[PDB]
RNA sequence: ACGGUCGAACUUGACUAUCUAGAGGAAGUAAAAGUCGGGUUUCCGUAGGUGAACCUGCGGAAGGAUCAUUAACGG
């Protein structure tokens, strides 16, 4: 029996505690994996028991809990539980353009937009989920959808206004046999 | 008449300033319906790319649209 341990930061302890039943129930019910949260090591531990139905379910659960810790909602990583062709690609915001200080903050703003609206628009077009950590961007979706979302985000964080980005991603989504 | 003094003005070169004729050159204008025919958020300073514009490099600005998380840490 093998196990996987994944860490949790201090800012994700309370979301883990509130959503704990919605996390451990799908892992143990139909995947059949033991789960605990070590408070000393601050780790979510997932284990294979005799009740595990099939191999690689523990990898599925590990991706689910890792996606929840990175900042995604519990149902958007339950999508990683159910679907097979889903991945979790992430990058830093300074990876494409060296931005210092206030400029960097403005880049973060034009991933969000007003009220988060711009971000949601990309999530509507690329069919992905984007999480903005403090200087990090995480995309959950299919491989081509991750490519479209990262193209939109990289276009946003090197200077393009949101309307041009919307038009470009709508043209690409029309061309992508969606 | 010698000499001294005040000194107009005259001649010669330089510095000039003004007035006044000009062969020629480079132009433009009116007359010829004569001949041939897509990219960009907005900038600043410096440098290069054929002068400017524009593009790129380097360093700066916003005069550019912040969503989500963050009470435990004791045995």
From Swiss-Prot:
Q: Does the keyword Cytoplasm apply?
A: no
List the GO biological process terms: ribosomal small subunit biogenesis
Domain of life according to the entry: Eukaryota
**Which organs or tissues contain this protein?**
Expressed in liver, lung, spleen and kidney. Weakly expressed in thymus, testis and ovary. Weakly or not expressed in heart, brain, skeletal muscle, placenta, pancreas, prostate, small intestine, colon and peripheral blood leukocytes.
Q: Coiled coil located at which positions?
A: none
Q: Where in the cell is it found?
A: Nucleus, Nucleolus
Q: Which GO terms describe its cellular component?
A: cytosol; nucleolus; nucleoplasm; nucleus; small-subunit processome
- Residue ranges occupied by any KH domain in the UniProt entry: 101-153
What molecular functions are annotated in GO for this chain?
RNA binding
Question: Which key words are in the record?
Answer: Acetylation, Nucleus, RNA-binding
Q: Which family does it belong to?
A: Belongs to the PNO1 family.
Function, as annotated: Part of the small subunit (SSU) processome, first precursor of the small eukaryotic ribosomal subunit. During the assembly of the SSU processome in the nucleolus, many ribosome biogenesis factors, an RNA chaperone and ribosomal proteins associate with the nascent pre-rRNA and work in concert to generate RNA folding, modifications, rearrangements and cleavage as well as targeted degradation of pre-ribosomal RNA by the RNA exosome. Positively regulates dimethylation of two adjacent adenosines in the loop of a conserved hairpin near the 3'-end of 18S rRNA.
The protein's assembly and partners: Part of the small subunit (SSU) processome, composed of more than 70 proteins and the RNA chaperone small nucleolar RNA (snoRNA) U3.
Q: What is this protein called?
A: RNA-binding protein PNO1
**Organism this protein belongs to:** Homo sapiens (Human)
Q: What does the record give as the organism's lineage?
A: Eukaryota, Metazoa, Chordata, Craniata, Vertebrata
Q: Which gene encodes it?
A: PNO1
């Amino acid at each position: 029996e093998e196990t996987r341990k994944i860490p949790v930061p201090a800012n994700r302890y309370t979301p883990l505690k509130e959503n704990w039943m919605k996390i451990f129930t799908p892992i143990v019910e139909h995947l059949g994996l033991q789960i605990r949260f070590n408070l000393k090591s601050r780790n979510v531990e997932i284990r294979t028991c005799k009740e595990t139905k099939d191999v690689s379910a523990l990898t599925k659960a590990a991706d689910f809990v890792k996606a929840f810790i990175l900042g995604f909602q519990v149902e958007d990583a339950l999508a990683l539980i159910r679907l097979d062709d889903l991945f979790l690609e992430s990058f830093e915001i300074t990876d494409v353009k060296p931005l210092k200080g206030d400029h960097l903050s403005r880049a973060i703003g034009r991933i969000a937009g007003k009220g988060g609206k711009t971000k949601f628009t990309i999530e509507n077009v690329t069919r992905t989920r984007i999480v903005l950590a403090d200087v990090k961007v995480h995309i959950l979706g299919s491989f081509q959808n991750i490519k479209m979302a990262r193209t939109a985000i990289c276009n946003l964080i090197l200077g393009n206004p949101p309307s041009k980005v919307y038009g470009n991603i709508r043209a690409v989504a029309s061309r992508s046999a969606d």
